[PDB]
Design a protein around this nucleic acid. Sequence first.
DNA 1: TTAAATAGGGAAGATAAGCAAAGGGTTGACGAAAGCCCTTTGTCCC
Length: 32
Amino acid sequence: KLKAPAVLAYSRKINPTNALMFAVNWSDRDNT
DNA sequence: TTAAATAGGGAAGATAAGCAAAGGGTTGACGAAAGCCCTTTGTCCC
């Protein structure tokens, strides 16, 4: 009947990082 | 070197699988109540 095994797991295929926030101007975004 | 006046309510804490086998565990010493025989000492008889 093709029953699922007792232990079966999958890893994570999309890895984001922790975002960082900075304050800049709309016309001088070079320095943060 | 101050008097008072209070300090949040609600929800919720995951599941599955398994815990090993083999080998050995020491020795010696801790008796009373008589039987017989011999020796010695002492008493008594012949």
